[PDB]
C-alpha cells in the first residue's frame, strides 16, 4: 500500500501500520541486545555503589 491513489482513512492507516513494522522489529532487536545490557548495569551499580 505504499502506492497512493486517493487513499481513504482505513487505507491510510493500513500502509503506515505496515511500514512501521519493519522498523519496530529493528527496535526490538536493539532493545533486547544492548539497551538491556546498559540498563541492567546501571541498576547494579546504583544498588551497590551508593
Amino acid at each position: 500500500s505504499s502506492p497512493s491513489s486517493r487513499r481513504s482513512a482505513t487505507e491510510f492507516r493500513g500502509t503506515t501500520s505496515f511500514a512501521s513494522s519493519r522498523l519496530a522489529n529493528l527496535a526490538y532487536f536493539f532493545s533486547v541486545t544492548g539497551f538491556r545490557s546498559l540498563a541492567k548495569s546501571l541498576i547494579v551499580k546504583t544498588q551497590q555503589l551508593y
Binding site: S2, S4, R7, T15, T16
Partner: protein, 50 residues
C-alpha cells in the same frame, strides 16, 4: 503590390519566421530538484510518509 508586381500571388511575398523554445520544459526538471532538496533538509519531507 507595387506596379512591377501587379500580377503576383499575394501569399508568397511575406511570412513570419517560426520560433520555438526548446528550453521550456526545464520546468519538470525544476520540480524534481526541489523535491530532492526537501529530502536533504527535511523541512517538509517526502520520506517517513507514504
Amino acid at each position: 503590390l507595387r506596379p512591377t508586381a501587379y500580377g503576383r500571388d499575394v501569399r508568397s511575398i511575406i511570412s513570419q519566421l517560426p520560433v520555438t523554445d526548446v528550453t521550456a520544459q526545464n520546468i519538470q526538471d525544476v520540480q524534481v530538484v526541489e523535491r530532492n532538496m526537501q529530502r536533504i533538509v527535511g523541512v517538509n519531507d517526502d520520506v517517513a510518509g507514504q
